[PDB]
Design an enzyme around this catalytic site. Structure first.
Site, PDB file in Angstrom:
ATOM      1  N   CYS A 158       3.371   1.557   9.456  1.00  0.00           N
ATOM      2  CA  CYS A 158       3.324   0.409   8.671  1.00  0.00           C
ATOM      3  C   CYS A 158       4.773   0.648   8.258  1.00  0.00           C
ATOM      4  CB  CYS A 158       2.628   1.025   7.310  1.00  0.00           C
ATOM      5  SG  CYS A 158       0.309   0.860   8.083  1.00  0.00           S
TER       6      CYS A 158
ATOM      7  N   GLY B  63       2.376   6.234   8.989  1.00  0.00           N
ATOM      8  CA  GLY B  63       4.071   5.763   9.215  1.00  0.00           C
ATOM      9  C   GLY B  63       4.210   5.075   9.658  1.00  0.00           C
TER      10      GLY B  63
ATOM     11  N   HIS C 152       0.982  -1.003  -0.039  1.00  0.00           N
ATOM     12  CA  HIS C 152      -0.005   0.401  -0.340  1.00  0.00           C
ATOM     13  C   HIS C 152       1.019   1.429  -0.134  1.00  0.00           C
ATOM     14  CE1 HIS C 152      -0.495  -0.240   4.732  1.00  0.00           C
ATOM     15  NE2 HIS C 152      -0.029   0.961   4.112  1.00  0.00           N
TER      16      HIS C 152
HETATM   17  C1  LIG Z   1       0.371   2.515   9.068  1.00  0.00           C
HETATM   18  C2  LIG Z   1       0.788   3.621   8.356  1.00  0.00           C
HETATM   19  O1  LIG Z   1       2.224   3.847   8.505  1.00  0.00           O
HETATM   20  N1  LIG Z   1       0.500   3.924   6.700  1.00  0.00           N
HETATM   21  C3  LIG Z   1      -1.034   3.406   6.115  1.00  0.00           C
HETATM   22  C4  LIG Z   1      -1.957   4.247   5.944  1.00  0.00           C
HETATM   23  N2  LIG Z   1      -0.975   5.512   5.094  1.00  0.00           N
HETATM   24  C5  LIG Z   1      -1.578   6.098   3.071  1.00  0.00           C
HETATM   25  C6  LIG Z   1      -1.360   4.678   3.189  1.00  0.00           C
HETATM   26  C7  LIG Z   1      -1.897   5.350   1.482  1.00  0.00           C
HETATM   27  C8  LIG Z   1      -1.970   6.576   1.172  1.00  0.00           C
HETATM   28  C9  LIG Z   1      -1.214   7.798   1.764  1.00  0.00           C
HETATM   29  C10 LIG Z   1      -1.411   7.413   2.949  1.00  0.00           C
HETATM   30  N3  LIG Z   1      -1.397   8.498   3.824  1.00  0.00           N
HETATM   31  O2  LIG Z   1      -1.965   9.035   4.380  1.00  0.00           O
HETATM   32  O3  LIG Z   1       0.119   8.408   4.447  1.00  0.00           O
HETATM   33  C11 LIG Z   1       0.252   6.009   5.478  1.00  0.00           C
HETATM   34  C12 LIG Z   1       1.117   4.659   5.900  1.00  0.00           C
END
Ligand SMILES: *CC(=O)N1CCN(c2ccccc2[N+](=O)[O-])CC1
Ligand SMILES: *CC(=O)N1CCN(c2ccccc2[N+](=O)[O-])CC1
Lengths: 304, 304
Positions: free
Chosen positions: B145, B143, B41
């Protein structure tokens, strides 16, 4: 979301841990620059531990009697001195893994991470608080002595604790990195009782703010109180008195949540007077007191 | 003595953590040898996250769109592939800090350490369990993830978990290092409810053995029970059924303490039926289920 008892990453400290052997006693040392810090009771036979004269015992010991091993490589000891309850072993090699560091003597109620070690090898890391009675509720077996407590500020390791003792009641006593005991404890196998282990009131309140932030809100009530009224309740339940300093420190958590410190105190008062009625808060059935306000901000903001 | 929720030393994993950026999404990767593992993702705009076609999204992405940073040094990406829910980024440099490692897919009830990370930098370490419903009760912000769960066996890091999701109920979901989710979760921003979070019965019993060893004994009773009788009580309280396998695993704790597994079950039964009556066990007001029998042996023996 979620809220966890979190230790600092232990890597920077793992790279400082060594094994110190004197005669047949082995324990952990901390190698920073060209100095290895260890508990002075490394020089004791467990006979010695009943009433040791460290000055007299240490006369019998030379540089070569201090066997210092980092991984499987031996360090050459070129000097030894006693500072309070620690030995400083001057070695001929600076630890290449020395991080930026300070020695700090913490206040009761302040939290730190312990890297528990045996024969200079890490076994695990957990978060602790310096209790108001200057004990810590650790996890330490024989060989764990010289394990260190620390905080990390970005890249700087602030060492606050070296492990020395288990009290007959199974709580832990030890020194700053200048070898001064927290509390009235001595490095002697004698009657040493801990004082009243009081609850760290400002930490519980920080933890209640952490709970609100994470959705656990059932304990928020309609009431408020005063510092004097709250402190009468705190006294009755062996909670530390709360000061305007404590209130000030809780300000940002108050500001983030929109719950006034004194309202949160009134929630805490009712919890003390009524108990939890079988409910939990951040998956705890009792009031957690080993997160500082700084700990709650850090975990709830993701400081690295 | 003393007993603590203890994480593995995090150093060996800290040396593997990197930052992965694709377009404007940043999260953590794990650099082992010449491969960086991250959640797929990383390629999503949060719009994409409603119903992403990862195959279709990834066609639009080249090697140079994956920005990999280890400390302040950039890694050259020479290949990229999707394996289930992770990306593997082939870089031109082997991580010099690659420890001995395996990828293992753990069973529910098994414990591991999480090094929570933001922009490829460690913030903290805590111990977790894979719940029976294949969630973990983590501490993770945006962040976080790509943060990884692990066990350490002497010098070998067994990676079991990479962080992907927070469920609408504030529990955490993620994959093994082959990118297969634990449980029925998908990397999509959709209705995903957790099943019944059952208590890990064998872990509670291990923890009761840990308590006895450490002097907390008030809950030992005069009774015994049978596996079938205990399991009727366990069912009623949403405890996992206990098997002869579980009994076998508890054998050494039984042998060390001299308390028969089925006697300890009968202590647990009474605790379930009567509650703790305001008492605590190893400083907990509820029954802890995130120590395995292996965890209790390890901490109670001082394995490094
Ligand atoms: C868990 C985490 O750090 N994470 C998941 C959500 N994420 C994200 C995913 C897709 C598109 C944008 C975003 N974001 O808001 O940064 C960030 C990373
Ligand atoms: C805490 C620890 O690891 N520790 C303190 C007790 N100890 C010791 C001191 C003096 C003499 C002998 C011994 N010993 O039994 O090893 C070992 C180190």
């Amino acid at each position: 979301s979620g809220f966890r008892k979190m230790a600092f990453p232990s890597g920077k400290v793992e790279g400082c841990m060594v094994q110190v052997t004197c005669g047949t006693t082995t324990l952990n040392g901390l190698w920073l620059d060209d100095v290895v810090y260890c508990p002075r009771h490394v020089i004791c036979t467990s006979e010695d531990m009943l009433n040791p004269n460290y000055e007299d015992l240490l006369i019998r010991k030379s540089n070569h009697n201090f066997l210092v091993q980092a991984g499987n490589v031996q360090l050459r000891v070129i000097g030894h001195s006693m500072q309070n309850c620690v030995l400083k072993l001057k070695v001929d090699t600076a630890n290449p893994k020395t991080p930026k560091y300070k020695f700090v003597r913490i206040q009761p109620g302040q939290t730190f991470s312990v890297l528990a070690c045996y024969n200079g090898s890490p076994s695990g890391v957990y978060q602790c608080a310096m209790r108001p009675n200057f004990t810590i509720k650790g996890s330490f077996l024989n060989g764990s002595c010289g394990s260190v407590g620390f905080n990390i500020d970005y890249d700087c390791v602030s060492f606050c604790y070296m492990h020395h003792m288990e009290l007959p009641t199974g709580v832990h006593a030890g020194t700053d990195l200048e070898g001064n005991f927290y509390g009235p404890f001595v490095d002697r196998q004698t009657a040493q009782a801990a004082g009243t282990d009081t609850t760290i009131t400002v930490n519980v309140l920080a933890w209640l703010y952490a709970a609100v932030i994470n959705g656990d809100r059932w304990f928020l009530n309609r009431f408020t109180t005063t510092l004097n009224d709250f402190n009468l309740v705190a006294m009755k339940y062996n909670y530390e008195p709360l000061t305007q300093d404590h209130v000030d420190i809780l300000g940002p958590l108050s500001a983030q949540t929109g719950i006034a410190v004194l309202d949160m105190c009134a929630s805490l008062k009712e919890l003390l007077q009524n108990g939890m009625n079988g409910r939990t808060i951040l998956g705890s059935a009792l009031l957690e007191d080993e997160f500082t306000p700084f700990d709650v901000v850090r975990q709830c903001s993701g400081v690295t």
